[PDB]
Each structure stands twice: as structure tokens, then as C-alpha cells.
């Protein structure tokens, strides 16, 4: 019979903290027996399993309907922290019952911000902010007036300053207009270079020096450049902690300055300074051109909170929370969750989302702690190319333990003032830069109960602005989904160690270490090689994916990062004790927890790594956020790149929970007049309106109805679509779009007018949204006839009589065909000027972003799957072939990021993980394994594999929601059968190459025509075999 298998809610068994009105349900079915639809569904809601034989909640009755994927619940309204236990039955088509499902759960979280009593806590001042530069003073030499103008000229300072008795730390913050070196005692401890500076007097360094600093006369000398005619200065505070409490050095006139460059020994403490001038005091901190400079600190600091629970029986208890920057809860000594980079990147002005974690196992009677790390993150910490302090200056955290008893009675433990807070072993925390960690800094014993924290500090009420929203998380949160041993270690350089983990990857690792306490080992993290074997960097820009440890000496260390991450294969180790083996170095692989939900496999190896680089470049680009690259200084959302890639995506991975949220981003950022921005969320004023990117506003829920059926993402999606295109129409003439945008980016010299690619998208979003309106009962004549006025003056424009597209490219001819705006005369001959193009390149593509993902497509829409295949199995550049013999394990930003002559393309914008060249996946998965949508959420499959090029041999399985797709076909002398499965209420229409269609043997299903040289047959459900012989 029919049986309901793996039921889920919101796309996941068991959500907990799922805020949803009206969350929605499926049920996969299964049957031995071919042929089975749903006639009716009957759901039941109750307070608890048991409970479901009456239940309490809601009761559907018997439903005459086919619908198995996403049913809204439609009982009474949901409350707040309830779990609400579910079944299901269906009726076949023969009017039969199903087994009741068996009973699942869904719990709902808090259901919005009046639900909170908890308050927005931080670490205090002297844990956040790095030593000021308040009550210091710009210094120069006496000439002029130097915060105005100053010669480009190189001066020299000096200051002996007598130092307090037992100094127990030293800080020095120092920064220059336009650089320095500074000396302690002759010993040089900073510096910064002309050839590197840009505006580097925005950013003053802190550097420990107690270890050139001790009681007594100190000689400090600093000399300072500045790069040309206009302002100059330096300034600094030399911090010292001591017993007694703090005492403050500056850059003031108490400092002697010269113009003359001094005789060799003018750093050391001896030398005779008394005929130099004082310095002059430029500006106050504050003043001047300069501005409120300030050292940016970026520690994820430890807070804490005891407190009793009464000794009854626990019932349940649950914590609920959040973050403005990063954190990582724990409760009497074990970490909560295993969620990574929790609580994820959005729009933190109008929105954050909060975790719902089970804690019942770990609360106690009596005494109980609860902990955590907050750190910057993309709240506080640099994001791409712009720096820090995106959002606010420091991280703030929100939480609340929610305890209930067996009596009915409950506790609720929240943040707050009595909370405690320390500055532990994480000392920095960056996202780009990397964290850094010193063991000997570890607080043994602070997560758990009895602890002594008297000489903690109180925390704070945070500053910062409030979110508008505090919502239930929608993606799978970050978590390791995979360890990948190092494979191999070499030492390029003496004491340099590299260790290859044999895949781009993209988290952090775990390092494993003995040695002496104070040892410090550096990791530095790579995608590629030198020749020499030695990692390159220089792609990476400002991002020095760089974690460092300094070791406590107890045994064998375990280091793993928490507040970065980084794309990376290789890993080089610096500063180690001795040598590092295989097993010093892990790699952690961090990604939006969701399934992967396609399995392919061919008989030829160069298609099976294709397949396996664009599931590592997916997952890679999957966490919080859909980025360009994971590697780099930028891991923005760009619009464009997932635009193209979405379809692909949602073949490989369950995109949906992911893609939906990241809409979410994306129409926070629409502007006032409707334009979607260039990357969601918005971040260093990059830009909006633009063809290719902004519309992925529309093609993305598209992709995600095509792939899944999701019609509420159609719903969520078509008011911010309506505006998107009035925003384009009224930035029209004629409806003609201007030549702007990013247009086919990296395409292979071959760069279409941007105004054709623009008009092109214009009407193609046009044309979705009709298509929505259609889906959704909507009227669709508006968007209809748009569509139409646009086509007609994109033809008008655009193409001509003999079926030319202006630029004559590639893409070109790839884009007017995939959105069906060549005039359907004219098809045949721009399908053929496309071919003519590919050949007169020697059978190579020179589609960019934009072109790609639809060139293997429109090749075979128009009957050349051949040419398709042709460029597929392609092995010289450009191709996907090439970058895999120079061992790709991802995609690359350019088809040229290795170039043929073994020389990388430019760091200056070079990525060896971006995933936009993988859209050709879809293809694969369409015409080899031959799964594609007939109808959307593949209530219909189309199998229709297409043997050709080197493929005589495919499997594939896809997860779909209505379960398990799955084809197997193969071709032997002169044979070919394919087998497949297809699940319960869904059908399939299947295409079988054949000589002679009336032939085709098979088990199941009706012969229905003969279709471009196959039998084309209609089938149910079932296990299916298709034979010619
Ligand atoms: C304040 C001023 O800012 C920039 O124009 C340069 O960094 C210059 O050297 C500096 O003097
Ligand atoms: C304070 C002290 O005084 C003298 O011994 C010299 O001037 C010496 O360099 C200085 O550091
Ligand atoms: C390459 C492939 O990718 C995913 O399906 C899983 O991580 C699987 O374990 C791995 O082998
Ligand atoms: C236009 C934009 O440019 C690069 O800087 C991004 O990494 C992204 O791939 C692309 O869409
Ligand atoms: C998040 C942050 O918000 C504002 O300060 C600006 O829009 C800025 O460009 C962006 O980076
Ligand atoms: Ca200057
Ligand atoms: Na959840
Ligand atoms: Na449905
Ligand atoms: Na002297």
C-alpha cells in the first residue's frame, strides 16, 4: 500500500523555534506499487503524541485533494513556545487509507520581541575598545603650521620618559601622517612603509611592548615621512599598567624633534639630543584634518552569570538567543548547540534572527552557570573591502533561559546588569583578518558553576541601535558539515610548512600542538600555490585569513577558531615546535546545515570532478549569506552571481530555507524607488539598478518554484517584483534600457552592449512576473502586455533581418534565444550564427556570468546538443575541462584564473572559489542524468537523458520533495535501457532514443508519440524499465 515517509515542516523534521502562522507541512509517500496518487490528506495537531488518537489542536478531516508539498497548517492560531506533535494519512486513488504518519513534532519559538524580557548586554569599555588616543596631541617639527602643509620630508623624534616600578602590561598606540618607525632603547618595535600607504593615519597599530619596556629612563625615538606637500604629523600613548593602576605617555611637546637628518646611534639611549628643538604640537587629538582617530579592537570577550534553579523536576527548558556580532553559548561546562558564526549576517537595522536550543539535559538543581563568547563579526568586524564597524562599534549579546518544572511552575534566567564579563584567550576575532588565541589567557573552570570571577567587570547595557525585529532564524544555521585530513606536508622554505588538505574548503581548522608555553604558531591560509611550492596570497587583497595560538604547555594542545573563516586548500604553519605531521592540521568545512539532494555519477571522470567542484564551490559560498567568494576581502550577496547560479543550486543542495531567507535580505535593501541593490545585504554603497544583478529579485523565486513548487515564495516576492519593474520602466526611453551594468562579466573577449543585456533582462523580468501572476490566480495581463511592448522594441533594436543580434557574441545570440525575444522566424538562424561563432573560436565558449548558465541550454532547445556536448567535453582553454586539469576543486571567478602559460591572472580581482561557472550543472542534471521539472516542484518529471559526447553510462537520484527521483540508463552494443524511479503523486514523461520508437519495450506506462527521434512515453509512479535492443 501507500505509506507517508520522512513528513516534514518548513522543509525539516523537527524544526524547533519556528515562528511561522502558518507552517507547512509535506509528506513524501511511498509505494511497491506503480501507478499511486492522493485522492484526499487528513492531518491532525495535538498537545502531544499520545494525544493525536483526540486531538486537541486541529483535526483537517478527510481533504479531497492531491496536495502533498507544502500544505499550509490552517488550524487555530499557534502560541508562543509550544511544541504541537502531527500526523498524516492519505487516501489512494482507489479511495484506500494510508497508515497514520508517525507522529512528528514542530515547536514554535518566542513569536517576536514582546516575548523578550532579556536585555542587550556587552563587555565594558576597557574589554572592547583598544587603547585611545584621547588627551594625545598630532605632533611634528616646528615648521609652519604642519596640519595644513608641511614639506615631503622625513623627521626625527626622541623622548626619555621614567617609568613607574612594577609594570605589568605596555601598550603602545601610535599612527602617522604618512609613516613611521618607532624604537624602544635602540630596539625597533613598528613601522609602516611609504610604497604601502594609503591613508594608513586612519588607522593607528597597538602593539604590546613590555617586553622592551621596565622601569626607570626609556628612550623612545620615532621618525616619521610624510609622502608629499600637505598635512603631516604623528601621535601616539604609551600605556602602563601596574600594580598601583594606569599611567599615560603622549606625543606632545615634552618631545624632541629635528630637521636634520642625525648622526647613526640618534635611537639609542645615550645619544645627545639637547641642541634639538621641542616638537610642536600640530593638533589635538580630535583636531586638525584627522578627525577622531581611533585603534579598532576586535576581541571576542567571555561573559557569564550564576545563578540558582530550585532542586524540582525539570520538565523542559530552552534557550533562546542572539547576538549584534557573533556568539557561542554555553551552560554548566558544555557548549550549547552546534550551530557556527551564530546568529548570521542580516540587515542588523531591521532585523536579526535568534536560535532556540533544547537545554533540558543540561540544567541542574541548585547552582548553574550560563556563558558565552561574543565577538564582532559582520556587525562589528571588517566586511569586504570597507572595513569595520558596519553596523556598531561593539558586539552585544541577548539572552534567555527559559526552565520548566514538572509542577507547572517555571524560571526564566535573561541577560542583564548582573552579568560578568573578561577578556579570555581570544584576544582578536575578524572575519577577514582571522582570530587570534592565547591559551595562557584560558579561565579554566568559567563555564561552569562555582567559579570566582570577584575580579571580572560588570557589564554593560549595550549601546547599540535596537534591531527593528527579532525573528526566528530561516536558514540551516553554519555548521561543520565535514573534516578533511591534510594529506600531505611540505617544507617549501626552512621551518615553513605547508599542508595540503587536497580540496578548496572553506571554515577553519583544527590544529593540534606540544610545546613550551608562549610558543606561538601562525596559520596562514591559501587557495593556490607559488611554483615553489610556497602558498600565494595575493588574491586574498586585504583578507589575512591569518589565525595565530600561542600555547599554555599542557600536553598535546587542540586549537579551533570560532569567530572566523576562510577559503582555503592549502595551510601554512609557521613558528611550530619541530615538525607538524598530517595529523596537525584539520580542516573544519562549515555551511548552511541542508541536505545534499543530487547524486550523479557518469562513466567519464572529467564530468564526475565537474560535478563534485561545483557542489565544493556551492557549499563553499553557502554560509549565512550567498556569496561571490568565500576567500577574499569582499563575501558579499552579490545579486548577479546567484541569479545565475540558483537553478543549479537548488539540483544540488535543499536551497530553499537558504534562498528564502537570503529574499528576505535582498528586498530589506530595495531602495525607496524600487531598485534591487548589487549585493544583499547592502554593505559600502556598491550600487543598485543593474541589469543582470538586480533581477535576481525575480529569477530567484522563480528558481525556487521551478525547482521546489514554493508558491509562497512567489506571494512573498511579487510586490517587491511590481516595483522592480516600475523602477526599470520609468529608467526607460522608449523602453530601451541604457547601456550600464556589469553586463557578460569575464566573458572571453567578446563584451556584448550592455544596453542589449539590459533591455534583454528588463523583458525577461517582465515576462516571470506574468508567469507569477499566472501561478498565484493573479491578473497577469499587466505583465503580459509589458512583456510584449518590450519584446517588440528589443526586436526593433536590436535584431535583424536576417537574425543578427547587435554585438554579434555569443551571448548575444545565447540571451535573445533563452528568453525567447529573437522573433520566432528567426530562431533557426541565430541558433545556427551561434554555432558558427563556437566553431570559429575551435569549438570553445566565450560566454561570461551572464551567457553560461544558458549556453548549454539554448544549444540543445535549438537541436544542437551535439555543439553542446562539443564544448562540454572540452579540455583547452576556455573550457570547465581546463581549469580541471590544473587540479580546480572548485570553479574560478575567470576561465583564465590560471593562465595557459602557468601564471596567475590579476590578485587585483582573482578567485579560485566562485561558483557563477557551475550554472552549467543544470544541464547535467537536465540532459544527462535527464531530471528536470515538467511541472514546477516536479509534480511532473521530464526524463529525457540525452547520450552524447563521451556519456554512454549516467546514475543520478534526486531528492526531491515528493522523495526520491532517480534515472540509470546506459548504452551497450547498440542497446540502451534505462530504469528509474518516480515517487508516489508525481508522473513522468519519458523520452527513449530510438530508431524504431514502436519498438521500446517496456514495463510500465503508455506509448503516447514519436518525438524527435524517440518514443516518448506518459507514466505514474513506480519503478520503470525502458529496453531497445
Ligand atoms: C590628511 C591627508 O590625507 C590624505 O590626503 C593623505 O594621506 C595625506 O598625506 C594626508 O596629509
Ligand atoms: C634622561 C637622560 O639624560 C642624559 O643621561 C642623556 O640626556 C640621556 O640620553 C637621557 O636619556
Ligand atoms: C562530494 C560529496 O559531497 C556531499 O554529497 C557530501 O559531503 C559527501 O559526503 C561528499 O562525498
Ligand atoms: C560584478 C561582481 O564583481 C566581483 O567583484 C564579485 O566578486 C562578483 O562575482 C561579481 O558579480
Ligand atoms: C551597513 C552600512 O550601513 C550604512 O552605514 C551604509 O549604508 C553603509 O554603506 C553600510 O556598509
Ligand atoms: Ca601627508
Ligand atoms: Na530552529
Ligand atoms: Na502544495
Ligand atoms: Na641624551
Same mark, same amino acid.
Do not use: C
Given at each position: 500500500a501507500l505509506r507517508v515517509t520522512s513528513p516534514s515542516v518548513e522543509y525539516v523534521? /523537527?524544526?524547533?523555534?519556528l515562528d511561522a502562522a502558518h507552517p507547512r507541512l509535506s509528506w513524501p509517500m511511498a509505494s511497491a506499487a506503480p501507478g499511486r496518487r492522493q485522492s484526499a490528506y487528513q492531518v491532525r495537531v495535538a498537545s502531544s503524541a499520545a494525544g493525536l488518537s483526540h486531538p486537541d489542536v486541529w483535526d483537517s478531516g478527510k481533504? $479531497?485533494?492531491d496536495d502533498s508539498v507544502? $500544505?499550509?497548517?490552517?488550524?487555530?492560531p499557534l502560541k508562543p513556545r509550544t511544541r504541537y506533535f502531527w500526523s498524516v494519512r492519505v487516501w489512494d486513488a482507489d479511495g484506500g487509507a494510508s497508515e497514520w504518519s508517525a507522529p512528528s513534532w514542530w515547536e514554535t519559538g518566542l513569536? &517576536?520581541?514582546?516575548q523578550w524580557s532579556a536585555k542587550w548586554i556587552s563587555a565594558p569599555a576597557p574589554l572592547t575598545e583598544?587603547?585611545?588616543?584621547?588627551? #594625545?596631541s598630532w605632533i611634528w617639527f616646528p615648521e609652519g603650521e604642519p596640519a595644513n602643509s608641511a614639506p615631503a620630508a622625513t623627521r626625527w623624534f626622541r623622548r626619555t620618559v621614567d617609568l613607574p616600578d612594577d609594570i605589568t602590561g605596555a601598550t603602545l598606540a601610535i599612527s602617522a601622517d604618512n609613516v613611521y618607525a618607532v624604537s624602544v632603547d635602540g630596539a625597533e618595535v613598528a613601522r609602516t612603509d611609504l610604497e604601502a600607504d594609503?591613508?594608513?593615519?586612519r588607522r593607528p597599530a597597538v602593539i604590546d611592548v613590555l617586553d622592551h619596556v621596565h622601569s626607570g629612563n626609556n628612550t623612545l625615538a620615532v621618525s616619521a615621512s610624510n609622502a608629499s606637500v600637505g598635512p603631516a604629523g604623528w601621535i601616539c600613548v604609551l600605556v602602563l599598567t601596574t600594580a598601583s593602576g594606569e599611567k599615560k605617555i603622549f606625543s606632545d611637546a615634552s618631545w624632541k624633534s629635528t630637521d636634520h637628518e642625525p648622526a647613526?646611534?640618534?635611537?639609542?639611549?645615550?645619544?645627545?639630543?639637547?641642541?634639538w628643538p621641542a616638537a610642536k604640537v =600640530? +593638533?589635538?587629538?580630535?583636531? &586638525?584634518?584627522?578627525?577622531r582617530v581611533a585603534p579598532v579592537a576586535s576581541a571576542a570577550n567571555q561573559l557569564r552569570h550564576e545563578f540558582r534553579l530550585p532542586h524540582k523536576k525539570v520538565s523542559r527548558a530552552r534557550l533562546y538567543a542572539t547576538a549584534l556580532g557573533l556568539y557561542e553559548a554555553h551552560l554548566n561546562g558544555r557548549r550549547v548547540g552546534?550551530?557556527?558564526? =551564530?546568529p548570521g549576517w542580516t540587515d542588523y537595522r531591521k532585523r536579526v534572527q535568534y536560535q532556540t536550543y533544547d537545554v533540558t539535559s543540561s540544567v541542574r538543581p541548585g547552582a548553574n552557570a550560563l556563558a558565552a563568547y561574543v565577538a564582532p563579526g559582520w556587525y562589528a568586524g571588517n566586511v569586504g573591502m570597507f572595513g569595520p564597524h558596519?553596523?556598531?562599534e561593539r558586539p552585544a549579546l541577548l539572552a534567555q533561559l527559559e526552565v520548566e518544572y514538572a509542577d507547572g511552575t517555571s524560571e526564566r534566567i535573561t541577560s542583564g546588569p548582573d552579568w560578568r564579563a573578561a577578556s579570555g584567550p581570544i584576544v582578536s576575532a575578524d572575519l577577514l583578518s582571522g582570530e587570534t588565541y592565547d591559551a595562557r589567557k584560558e579561565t579554566a @573552570?568559567? !563555564?561552569?558553576?562555582?567559579?570566582?570571577?570577584?575580579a571580572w567587570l560588570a557589564v554593560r547595557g549595550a549601546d547599540n541601535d535596537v534591531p527593528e525585529q527579532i525573528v526566528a532564524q530561516v536558514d540551516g544555521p553554519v555548521r561543520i558539515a565535514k573534516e578533511l585530513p591534510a594529506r600531505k606536508v611540505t617544507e617549501?622554505?626552512?621551518?615553513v610548512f605547508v599542508l595540503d588538505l587536497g580540496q578548496n574548503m572553506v571554515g577553519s581548522v583544527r590544529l593540534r600542538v606540544s610545546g613550551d608555553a608562549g610558543t606561538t604558531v601562525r596559520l596562514r591560509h591559501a587557495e593556490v600555490l607559488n611554483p615553489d611550492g610556497t602558498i600565494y596570497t595575493?588574491?586574498?587583497?586585504?583578507?589575512?585569513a591569518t589565525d595565530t595560538y600561542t600555547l599554555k604547555?599542557? @600536553?598535546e594542545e587542540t586549537y579551533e577558531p570560532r569567530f572566523t573563516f576562510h577559503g582555503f586548500r592549502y595551510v601554512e604553519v609557521t613558528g611550530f615546535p619541530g615538525k607538524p605531521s598530517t595529523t596537525s592540521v584539520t580542516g573544519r568545512v562549515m555551511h548552511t546545515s541542508a541536505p545534499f539532494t543530487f547524486e550523479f555519477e557518469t562513466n567519464v571522470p572529467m564530468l564526475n570532478k565537474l560535478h563534485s567542484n561545483i557542489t565544493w564551490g556551492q557549499r563553499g559560498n553557502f554560509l549565512s549569506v550567498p556569496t561571490?567568494?568565500?576567500? /577574499?576581502?569582499e563575501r558579499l550577496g552579490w545579486t548577479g552571481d546567484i541569479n545565475v547560479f540558483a537553478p543549479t543550486a537548488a539540483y544540488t543542495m535543499e536551497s530553499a530555507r537558504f534562498l528564502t531567507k537570503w529574499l528576505v535580505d535582498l528586498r530589506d535593501a530595495?531602495? #525607496?524607488?524600487g531598485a534591487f541593490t548589487?549585493?544583499?545585504?547592502?554593505?559600502?554603497?556598491?550600487?543598485?539598478?543593474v541589469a543582470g544583478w538586480g533581477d535576481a529579485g525575480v529569477t530567484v523565486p522563480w528558481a525556487l518554484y521551478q525547482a521546489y513548487g514554493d508558491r509562497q515564495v512567489l506571494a512573498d516576492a511579487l510586490p517587491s517584483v511590481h516595483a522592480w519593474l516600475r523602477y526599470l520602466e520609468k529608467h526607460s526611453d522608449g523602453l530601451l534600457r541604457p547601456a550600464?551594468?556589469?553586463?557578460?562579466?569575464?566573458?572571453?573577449?567578446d563584451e556584448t552592449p550592455k544596453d542589449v543585456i539590459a533591455t534583454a533582462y528588463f523583458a525577461h523580468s517582465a515576462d516571470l512576473a506574468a508567469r507569477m501572476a499566472t501561478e498565484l490566480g493573479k491578473d497577469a495581463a499587466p505583465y503580459t502586455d509589458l512583456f510584449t511592448r518590450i519584446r517588440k522594441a528589443f526586436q526593433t533594436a536590436?535584431? +535583424?533581418?536576417?537574425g543578427k543580434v547587435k554585438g554579434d557574441t555569443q551571448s548575444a545570440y545565447v540571451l535573445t534565444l533563452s528568453m525567447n525575444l529573437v522573433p520566432d522566424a528567426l530562431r533557426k538562424a541565430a541558433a545556427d550564427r551561434l554555432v558558427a561563432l563556437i566553431e570559429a573560436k575551435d569549438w570553445h565558449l566565450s560566454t561570461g556570468f551572464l551567457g553560461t548558465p544558458r549556453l548549454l541550454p539554448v544549444l540543445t532547445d535549438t537541436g544542437h546538443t551535439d555543439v553542446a556536448y562539443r564544448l562540454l567535453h572540452q579540455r583547452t582553454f576556455? #573550457?570547465?575541462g581546463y581549469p580541471i586539469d590544473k587540479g580546480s576543486t572548485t570553479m574560478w571567478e575567470?576561465?583564465?584564473?590560471?593562465?595557459?602559460?602557468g601564471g596567475f591572472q590579476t590578485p587585483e580581482m582573482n578567485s579560485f572559489? %566562485?561558483? =557563477?561557472?557551475?550554472?552549467?550543472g543544470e544541464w547535467m542534471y537536465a540532459?544527462?542524468?535527464?531530471?528536470?521539472? @515538467? /511541472?514546477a516542484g516536479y509534480r511532473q518529471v521530464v526524463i529525457r537523458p540525452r547520450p552524447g559526447g563521451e556519456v554512454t553510462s549516467a546514475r543520478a537520484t534526486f531528492a526531491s520533495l515528493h522523495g526520491p527521483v532517480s534515472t540509470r540508463w546506459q548504452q551497450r552494443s547498440g542497446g540502451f535501457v534505462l530504469t528509474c524511479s518516480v515517487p508516489p503523486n508525481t508522473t513522468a514523461e519519458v523520452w527513449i532514443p530510438a530508431? %524504431?520508437?514502436?519498438?521500446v519495450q517496456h !514495463? %510500465?506506462?503508455?506509448?503516447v508519440r514519436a518525438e524527435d527521434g524517440c518514443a516518448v512515453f506518459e507514466v505514474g509512479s513506480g519503478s520503470h524499465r525502458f529496453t531497445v535492443k
Open positions: 523534521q /523537527r524544526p524547533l523555534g481533504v $479531497v485533494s507544502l $500544505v499550509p497548517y490552517a488550524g487555530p513569536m &517576536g520581541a514582546s583598544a587603547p585611545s588616543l584621547e588627551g #594625545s594609503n591613508e594608513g593615519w647613526d646611534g640618534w635611537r639609542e639611549p645615550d645619544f645627545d639630543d639637547s641642541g =600640530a +593638533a589635538a587629538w580630535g583636531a &586638525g584634518p584627522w578627525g552546534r550551530d557556527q558564526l =551564530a558596519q553596523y556598531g @573552570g568559567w !563555564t561552569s558553576p562555582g567559579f570566582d570571577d570577584r617549501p622554505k626552512p621551518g595575493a588574491n586574498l587583497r586585504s583578507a589575512a604547555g599542557q @600536553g561571490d567568494t568565500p576567500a /577574499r576581502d530595495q531602495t #525607496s524607488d548589487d549585493v544583499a545585504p547592502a554593505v559600502g554603497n556598491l550600487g543598485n539598478g550600464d551594468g556589469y553586463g557578460d562579466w569575464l566573458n572571453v573577449s536590436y535584431v +535583424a533581418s536576417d576556455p #573550457s570547465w575567470r576561465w583564465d584564473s590560471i593562465q595557459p602559460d572559489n %566562485h561558483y =557563477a561557472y557551475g550554472s552549467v540532459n544527462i542524468a535527464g531530471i528536470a521539472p @515538467g /511541472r530508431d %524504431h520508437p514502436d519498438r !514495463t %510500465h506506462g503508455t506509448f
